[PDB]
Design an enzyme around this catalytic site. Structure first.
Site, PDB file in Angstrom:
ATOM      1  N   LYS A  19     -21.062  11.432  15.470  1.00 32.11           N
ATOM      2  CA  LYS A  19     -20.777  10.648  14.297  1.00 32.11           C
ATOM      3  C   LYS A  19     -21.636   9.403  14.199  1.00 32.11           C
ATOM      4  O   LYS A  19     -22.129   9.104  13.111  1.00 32.11           O
ATOM      5  CB  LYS A  19     -19.304  10.265  14.250  1.00 32.11           C
ATOM      6  CG  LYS A  19     -18.807   9.800  12.890  1.00 32.11           C
ATOM      7  CD  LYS A  19     -19.081  10.837  11.789  1.00 32.11           C
ATOM      8  CE  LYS A  19     -18.106  10.749  10.584  1.00 32.11           C
ATOM      9  NZ  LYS A  19     -18.395   9.615   9.688  1.00 32.11           N
TER      10      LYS A  19
ATOM     11  N   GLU B  89     -13.934  11.719  10.613  1.00 25.88           N
ATOM     12  CA  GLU B  89     -13.908  12.212   9.242  1.00 25.88           C
ATOM     13  C   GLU B  89     -15.258  12.023   8.578  1.00 25.88           C
ATOM     14  O   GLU B  89     -15.838  10.954   8.659  1.00 25.88           O
ATOM     15  CB  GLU B  89     -12.812  11.521   8.418  1.00 25.88           C
ATOM     16  CG  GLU B  89     -12.612  12.115   6.985  1.00 25.88           C
ATOM     17  CD  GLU B  89     -12.684  13.670   6.927  1.00 25.88           C
ATOM     18  OE1 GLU B  89     -11.781  14.356   7.509  1.00 25.88           O
ATOM     19  OE2 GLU B  89     -13.646  14.199   6.291  1.00 25.88           O
TER      20      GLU B  89
ATOM     21  N   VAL C  19      -6.966   3.732  11.521  1.00 27.32           N
ATOM     22  CA  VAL C  19      -6.907   2.337  11.108  1.00 27.32           C
ATOM     23  C   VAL C  19      -8.315   1.827  11.050  1.00 27.32           C
ATOM     24  O   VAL C  19      -9.253   2.549  11.387  1.00 27.32           O
ATOM     25  CB  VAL C  19      -6.085   1.473  12.073  1.00 27.32           C
ATOM     26  CG1 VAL C  19      -4.669   1.973  12.117  1.00 27.32           C
ATOM     27  CG2 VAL C  19      -6.713   1.467  13.449  1.00 27.32           C
TER      28      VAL C  19
ATOM     29  N   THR D 123     -15.632  -5.774  12.068  1.00 27.61           N
ATOM     30  CA  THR D 123     -16.622  -6.338  12.960  1.00 27.61           C
ATOM     31  C   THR D 123     -16.128  -7.725  13.404  1.00 27.61           C
ATOM     32  O   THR D 123     -15.552  -8.477  12.613  1.00 27.61           O
ATOM     33  CB  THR D 123     -17.996  -6.376  12.275  1.00 27.61           C
ATOM     34  OG1 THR D 123     -17.779  -6.449  10.882  1.00 27.61           O
ATOM     35  CG2 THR D 123     -18.776  -5.073  12.506  1.00 27.61           C
TER      36      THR D 123
ATOM     37  N   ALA E 131     -24.586   8.879  15.294  1.00 33.08           N
ATOM     38  CA  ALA E 131     -25.931   9.270  14.987  1.00 33.08           C
ATOM     39  C   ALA E 131     -26.013   9.787  13.574  1.00 33.08           C
ATOM     40  O   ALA E 131     -26.877   9.364  12.793  1.00 33.08           O
ATOM     41  CB  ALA E 131     -26.418  10.305  15.957  1.00 33.08           C
TER      42      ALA E 131
ATOM     43  N   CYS F 105     -18.814   1.968   6.121  1.00 33.39           N
ATOM     44  CA  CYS F 105     -19.515   2.737   7.152  1.00 33.39           C
ATOM     45  C   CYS F 105     -20.915   2.261   7.547  1.00 33.39           C
ATOM     46  O   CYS F 105     -21.076   1.665   8.635  1.00 33.39           O
ATOM     47  CB  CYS F 105     -19.636   4.199   6.754  1.00 33.39           C
ATOM     48  SG  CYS F 105     -20.363   5.290   8.089  1.00 33.39           S
TER      49      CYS F 105
ATOM     50  N   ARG G 124       0.820  -1.215   0.000  1.00 30.23           N
ATOM     51  CA  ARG G 124       0.000   0.000   0.000  1.00 30.23           C
ATOM     52  C   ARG G 124       0.858   1.271   0.000  1.00 30.23           C
ATOM     53  O   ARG G 124       0.580   2.197  -0.741  1.00 30.23           O
ATOM     54  CB  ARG G 124      -0.947  -0.001   1.203  1.00 30.23           C
ATOM     55  CG  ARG G 124      -2.357   0.507   0.918  1.00 30.23           C
ATOM     56  CD  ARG G 124      -3.149   0.535   2.203  1.00 30.23           C
ATOM     57  NE  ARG G 124      -4.566   0.886   2.058  1.00 30.23           N
ATOM     58  CZ  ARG G 124      -5.528   0.006   1.803  1.00 30.23           C
ATOM     59  NH1 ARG G 124      -5.212  -1.277   1.631  1.00 30.23           N
ATOM     60  NH2 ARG G 124      -6.795   0.396   1.705  1.00 30.23           N
TER      61      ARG G 124
ATOM     62  N   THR H  34     -11.491  -0.908  11.955  1.00 29.11           N
ATOM     63  CA  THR H  34     -12.020  -1.674  13.074  1.00 29.11           C
ATOM     64  C   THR H  34     -13.002  -2.694  12.506  1.00 29.11           C
ATOM     65  O   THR H  34     -14.193  -2.394  12.422  1.00 29.11           O
ATOM     66  CB  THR H  34     -12.713  -0.748  14.132  1.00 29.11           C
ATOM     67  OG1 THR H  34     -13.860  -0.089  13.566  1.00 29.11           O
ATOM     68  CG2 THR H  34     -11.756   0.297  14.650  1.00 29.11           C
TER      69      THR H  34
ATOM     70  N   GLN I 114     -23.597   0.118   7.434  1.00 27.99           N
ATOM     71  CA  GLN I 114     -24.012  -1.102   8.129  1.00 27.99           C
ATOM     72  C   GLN I 114     -23.230  -1.278   9.420  1.00 27.99           C
ATOM     73  O   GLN I 114     -23.805  -1.627  10.469  1.00 27.99           O
ATOM     74  CB  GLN I 114     -23.894  -2.335   7.235  1.00 27.99           C
ATOM     75  CG  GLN I 114     -24.049  -3.617   7.969  1.00 27.99           C
ATOM     76  CD  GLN I 114     -24.346  -4.782   7.090  1.00 27.99           C
ATOM     77  OE1 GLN I 114     -25.332  -4.775   6.359  1.00 27.99           O
ATOM     78  NE2 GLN I 114     -23.520  -5.815   7.170  1.00 27.99           N
TER      79      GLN I 114
HETATM   80  O1  LIG Z   1     -29.304   8.635  -2.220  1.00 26.57           O
HETATM   81  C1  LIG Z   1     -28.520   7.675  -2.003  1.00 26.57           C
HETATM   82  C2  LIG Z   1     -27.226   7.940  -1.556  1.00 26.57           C
HETATM   83  C3  LIG Z   1     -26.366   6.877  -1.329  1.00 26.57           C
HETATM   84  N1  LIG Z   1     -26.789   5.603  -1.527  1.00 26.57           N
HETATM   85  C4  LIG Z   1     -25.880   4.455  -1.290  1.00 26.57           C
HETATM   86  O2  LIG Z   1     -25.312   4.380   0.035  1.00 26.57           O
HETATM   87  C5  LIG Z   1     -23.922   4.063  -0.027  1.00 26.57           C
HETATM   88  C6  LIG Z   1     -23.066   5.088   0.714  1.00 26.57           C
HETATM   89  O3  LIG Z   1     -22.763   6.206  -0.105  1.00 26.57           O
HETATM   90  P1  LIG Z   1     -21.976   7.439   0.563  1.00 26.57           P
HETATM   91  O4  LIG Z   1     -22.697   7.791   1.841  1.00 26.57           O
HETATM   92  O5  LIG Z   1     -21.792   8.670  -0.289  1.00 26.57           O
HETATM   93  O6  LIG Z   1     -20.498   6.827   0.730  1.00 26.57           O
HETATM   94  P2  LIG Z   1     -19.617   6.841   2.069  1.00 26.57           P
HETATM   95  O7  LIG Z   1     -18.156   6.829   1.695  1.00 26.57           O
HETATM   96  O8  LIG Z   1     -20.044   5.670   2.915  1.00 26.57           O
HETATM   97  O9  LIG Z   1     -19.967   8.246   2.817  1.00 26.57           O
HETATM   98  C7  LIG Z   1     -21.029   8.470   3.799  1.00 26.57           C
HETATM   99  O10 LIG Z   1     -20.631   7.819   4.988  1.00 26.57           O
HETATM  100  C8  LIG Z   1     -19.358   8.392   5.306  1.00 26.57           C
HETATM  101  C9  LIG Z   1     -18.675   7.511   6.283  1.00 26.57           C
HETATM  102  O11 LIG Z   1     -18.585   6.318   5.519  1.00 26.57           O
HETATM  103  C10 LIG Z   1     -19.613   9.712   5.952  1.00 26.57           C
HETATM  104  O12 LIG Z   1     -18.389  10.158   6.507  1.00 26.57           O
HETATM  105  C11 LIG Z   1     -20.047  10.594   4.827  1.00 26.57           C
HETATM  106  O13 LIG Z   1     -20.382  11.825   5.434  1.00 26.57           O
HETATM  107  C12 LIG Z   1     -21.269   9.961   4.150  1.00 26.57           C
HETATM  108  O14 LIG Z   1     -21.582  10.709   2.961  1.00 26.57           O
HETATM  109  C13 LIG Z   1     -23.546   3.925  -1.493  1.00 26.57           C
HETATM  110  O15 LIG Z   1     -23.404   2.519  -1.732  1.00 26.57           O
HETATM  111  C14 LIG Z   1     -24.704   4.568  -2.246  1.00 26.57           C
HETATM  112  O16 LIG Z   1     -25.082   3.939  -3.469  1.00 26.57           O
HETATM  113  C15 LIG Z   1     -28.114   5.367  -1.973  1.00 26.57           C
HETATM  114  O17 LIG Z   1     -28.527   4.205  -2.159  1.00 26.57           O
HETATM  115  N2  LIG Z   1     -28.936   6.402  -2.202  1.00 26.57           N
END
Ligand SMILES: O=c1ccn([C@@H]2O[C@H](COP(=O)(O)OP(=O)(O)O[C@H]3O[C@H](CO)[C@@H](O)[C@H](O)[C@H]3O)[C@@H](O)[C@H]2O)c(=O)[nH]1
Ligand SMILES: NC(=O)c1ccc[n+]([C@@H]2O[C@H](COP(=O)([O-])OP(=O)(O)OC[C@H]3O[C@@H](n4cnc5c(N)ncnc54)[C@H](O)[C@@H]3O)[C@@H](O)[C@H]2O)c1
Ligand SMILES: NC(=O)c1ccc[n+]([C@@H]2O[C@H](COP(=O)([O-])OP(=O)(O)OC[C@H]3O[C@@H](n4cnc5c(N)ncnc54)[C@H](O)[C@@H]3O)[C@@H](O)[C@H]2O)c1
Ligand SMILES: O=c1ccn([C@@H]2O[C@H](COP(=O)(O)OP(=O)(O)O[C@H]3O[C@H](CO)[C@@H](O)[C@H](O)[C@H]3O)[C@@H](O)[C@H]2O)c(=O)[nH]1
Ligand SMILES: O=c1ccn([C@@H]2O[C@H](COP(=O)(O)OP(=O)(O)O[C@H]3O[C@H](CO)[C@@H](O)[C@H](O)[C@H]3O)[C@@H](O)[C@H]2O)c(=O)[nH]1
EC number: 1.1.1.22
Lengths: 460, 162, 460
Positions: free
Chosen positions: C220, C161, C89, C93, C222, C276, C41, C91, C278
């Site tokens: 976060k 973040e 890093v 499940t 919530a 994130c 990496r 975490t 789930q």
């Molecule tokens: O209207 C929507 C928006 C998103 N998704 C899905 O939900 C998942 C998550 O997308 P997104 O939330 O943009 O990606 P993340 O990188 O998980 O980012 C979100 O979760 C992050 C932590 O993972 C937070 O930090 C961010 O603020 C938040 O936008 C994806 O598979 C998307 O397809 C939908 O089905 N419908």
């Protein structure tokens, strides 16, 4: 050192009455006033016949009443004047709301606390003295912390009472241990010492346990539960004995010789009564639930459910022996008190057994040497009582034309009865249901007389 | 919304008209559309079919009620752990994808709408054989019952349970 | 007035890499070193092609790597020479023990903490930086409290973040808000101020929210759950649309015009993915269960249950539409990443759709623009991958000879595919399952072309 010179006890019941009468007797140089809202109860305390029956209580009271021990309804002046204030009121279980039928109502404790603050100035020790203390000392403290005057210094103590009714005087004169709870402050241990010095007049120092307020209350709860548990455990075994042709009394004997188990409180019976055990375990279960302890709760719940089962099992046996129909049948109920040597009926097994036969439309004839007639009818109420309940003036009026004689309380007189006479005027089959094991050893005589005697923990 | 009805009517976020997808129809929708055009700008008026309008309303009220219940659930969690729901609602709210509106924790939501609206949505879903969807929205009502009840208990508790 | 000159970050992931790259870019005079145990990496972060795909990251990284930004794997010296230390890093499940498949395993956060203590002297600020902080900050502090050196002064801050993978740079360049948690002491507030000053280089003062450590993590937890709830809420509505005959894109617009609700995150889909959402909800449920809040745990659980149902329903529709068998049938899977513009597969619904179809015997053909080939094979197994799974080099390969095309990832390019070409070589009738709604407006074109196009939130 602070010396208690004057004592005031709010509550002139089975707890405050006998306790203070002993305190006063053992401590000549300290004035004890017992107070109560109940004008009827107070006048009786000052009379030739006392409001509660308790062997030896009269002689104790009459040796220091008017001299050292006083009974008054003047609660204000007694509070104003005192160094120590016992709160010994009752906590009836809530009849509605959350905790209905299980948790104890603290309203009278709260009311007393409020009244102390109103009528107090300077230093006073306030001690909660109950049989089942439920968050009591903390309730008092919360009132005292919120309503302060200048120069008002009130110390809260816990001092749970261990006496058992029927043997109150002996227990108070010679207790296994005295337990006192008080805050771990220096203020604190000083109040504890003051009350500790009151007990030291007659209790050896080694039998006085001093801890904090909660540990005191929790000890009382548990001790009470342990005691109820022994009766329920042996009663469970009684069911098992009847089912397998063994005898609970012999079993109990073999159990009790193990010095680790002990031989006390193993007398199988119709079920435990009294204003303590049930109230105690129900509040312990409630507490546990409140503290997210479903396992602990579930464990103590069994003590009550076993007691409840014992009662129904016994009632069912009576009904059964009467071809499942008791409509318009005369049945004697011998003994109403929850226990022998007391006039107290609170939570008595006799109430429950009576009601089960009532529902079967039995004509009950209740006899008890000490329980007042009026109390019996109140206990068996809320028109059905007018129909089914008669209060006999002596046992023979009760068994005159009865189908069954039900013994619920171990009054010593019930062994002395003339069972020759009783059987002659009973309708046959004549049943005796011995729910106390009082008639043990008389079995052969009773069978040759013509009875069919059924007892608990033993079935033919 | 009751209590700000006049503002909400004078200056709505959107107006929603559901009509039949016939030409008969669209002529009926336009007339009403033209009543609102007196004070409502054209790009704030949504035209759809009958059912698509009724489902959007149901959804719309359900989504708002869920907002209150979600922050209410967080309120319980705050009390158990020494945080402040108002401080949390701020941090949550500042995300432009969540929005900062309707995140005021409370004794629980009332009104002739939300409770009736959610329970109806549930009932519909059960009727259409969608027990998954029913169970989901049922949690909006249950959380609200819980919040009220938790509030009631705290009062009783603090008064020694009597 | 403590000022930060040297930053070390433990974790060269989707969080750590991009975050520190922006911090380096925005702050030229502060040296930022990113460290990892994973040599592969780190080598990649030093080469022409990075280990992750993120629009714009290549420019950010190449504009200050080796001037101001470094990647090392020499974790020991970076820690030793740093003022602020990020712990970014992962975490995972837990896979066994209590909390299996739900609770987060803190084994890396702890090991980090432990290594910092070993390599640290004097003052240092240690900040926990993650997407899902579950009792992270406490764990660290617990390690530091118990393992103190002479003249070591470590401060623990929380700094969750909010970046979203795919738009990380934009989000890091212009965040909705910045969240810093630290102790409500003066030791304390000073470490918070010193991190606050880092961000004040490109984020204005009133967008930086400062609270206490726990509040920060709860905030976060919530926030992640609220967003997850929107996706599930609209996905539930999409199910309702299909049984009644309305359009979820249309119903979503009606909803979104309410400014109290807002119009973002209302795109219905096959099911939300990523490391994130789930993980966040499952850990929120677990926390609640541990604090005896069943009702709250039951409430947020529904966000997971609904997402599961969305995935399962979509899958059944595919098998349903192909006469209830896909045995020996060629099916194209377009898009494998959890969302667009990223290489990341973690918790992707493509992984689930693919597995579910394989279990029914489909020969799948997978294509994704940025997911590496090797990743797909891992995800899809735990030999059956040999028989059923082929990895296509272009969309048109996946589609040639195929009975159906499933779109799982809203890649922009998918709209731009040559559909006349795709139809020509598909087996008929040809089906398109749009699990992302990306082919709206294209309906007519595609139907007239001869397709049977089935999409979520709309039924024929
Ligand atoms: O209207 C929507 C928006 C998103 N998704 C899905 O939900 C998942 C998550 O997308 P997104 O939330 O943009 O990606 P993340 O990188 O998980 O980012 C979100 O979760 C992050 C932590 O993972 C937070 O930090 C961010 O603020 C938040 O936008 C994806 O598979 C998307 O397809 C939908 O089905 N419908
Ligand atoms: C039960 O039993 C134990 C004590 O019960 P007991 O047998 O003494 O009960 P008891 O009811 O026989 O005696 C309690 C006495 O307190 C009196 N009392 C009740 N409220 C009062 C008030 N607010 N002000 C003054 N007096 C009041 C009653 O008149 C009663 O005589 C306790 O431990 C409790 O758990
Ligand atoms: C999970 O995942 C999120 C983190 O996001 P992410 O995408 O960066 O995860 P990620 O897997 O992409 O990044 C984690 C990185 O940290 C490194 N790492 C893990 N443990 C380490 C240790 N013991 N010492 C040194 N390096 C270590 C790994 O090599 C990995 O590259 C958390 O917020 C939580 O929700
Ligand atoms: O082996 C036994 C022992 C007792 N009992 C019954 O148990 C009940 C309670 O009897 P007892 O404990 O003698 O009277 P209490 O007045 O309830 O006294 C107990 O209850 C008080 C209140 O808690 C405690 O303070 C005492 O220490 C404790 O002995 C009565 O119904 C008895 O008939 C029987 O069923 N079998
Ligand atoms: O952050 C909040 C906001 C509201 N409420 C409570 O929720 C209930 C309903 O609030 P509100 O939505 O303002 O009242 P309604 O009159 O029911 O209006 C809503 O419900 C209407 C249908 O009844 C919709 O037409 C409106 O657009 C929508 O605002 C009330 O008890 C509020 O106190 C909260 O607890 N927290």
């Amino acid at each position: 050192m602070f010396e208690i010179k004057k004592i005031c006890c709010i509550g002139a019941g089975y707890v405050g009455g006998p306790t203070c009468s002993v305190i006063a007797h053992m401590c000549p140089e300290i004035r004890v006033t017992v107070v109560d809202v109940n004008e009827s109860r107070i006048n009786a305390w000052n009379s030739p016949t006392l409001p509660i029956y308790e062997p030896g209580l009269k002689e104790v009271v009459e040796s220091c009443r008017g001299k050292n021990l006083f009974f008054s309804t003047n609660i204000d002046d007694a509070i104003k004047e005192a160094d120590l204030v016992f709160i010994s009121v009752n906590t009836p279980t809530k009849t509605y709301g959350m905790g209905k039928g299980r948790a104890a109502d603290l309203k009278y404790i709260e009311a007393c606390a409020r009244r102390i603050v109103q009528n107090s100035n300077g230093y006073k020790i306030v001690t909660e003295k109950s049989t089942v203390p439920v968050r009591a000392a903390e309730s008092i403290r919360r009132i005292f912390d919120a309503n302060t005057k200048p120069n008002l210094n009130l110390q809260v103590l816990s001092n749970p009472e261990f006496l058992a009714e029927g043997t109150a005087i002996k227990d108070l004169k010679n207790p296994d241990r005295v337990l006192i709870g008080g805050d771990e402050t220096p203020e604190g241990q000083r109040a504890v010492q003051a009350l500790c010095a009151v007990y030291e007049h007659w209790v050896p120092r080694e039998k006085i346990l001093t801890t904090n307020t909660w540990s005191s209350e929790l000890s009382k709860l548990a001790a009470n539960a342990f005691l109820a548990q022994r009766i329920s455990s042996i009663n469970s075994i009684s069911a098992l004995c009847e089912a397998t042709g063994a005898d609970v009394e012999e079993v109990a004997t073999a159990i009790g010789m193990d010095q680790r188990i002990g031989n006390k409180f193993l007398k199988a019976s119709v079920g435990f009564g009294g204003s303590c055990f049930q109230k105690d375990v129900l509040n312990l279960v409630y507490l546990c639930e409140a503290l997210n302890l479903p396992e602990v709760a579930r464990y103590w719940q069994q003590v009550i459910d076993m007691n409840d089962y014992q009662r129904r099992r016994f009632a069912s046996r009576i009904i059964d022996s009467l071809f499942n129909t008791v409509t318009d049948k005369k049945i004697a109920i011998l003994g109403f008190a929850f226990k022998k040597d007391t006039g107290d009926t609170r939570e008595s097994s006799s109430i429950y057994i009576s009601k089960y036969l009532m529902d079967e439309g039995a004509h009950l004839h209740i006899y008890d040497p000490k329980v007042p007639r009026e109390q019996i009818v109140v206990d068996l109420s809320h028109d059905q009582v007018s129909r089914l309940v008669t209060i006999s003036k002596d046992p023979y009026e009760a068994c005159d034309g009865a189908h069954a004689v039900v013994i619920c309380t171990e009054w010593d007189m019930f062994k002395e009865l003339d069972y020759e006479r009783i059987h002659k005027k009973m309708l046959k089959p004549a049943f005796i249901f011995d729910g106390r094991r009082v008639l043990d050893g008389l079995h052969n005589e009773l069978q040759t007389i013509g009875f069919q005697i059924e007892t608990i923990g033993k079935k033919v």
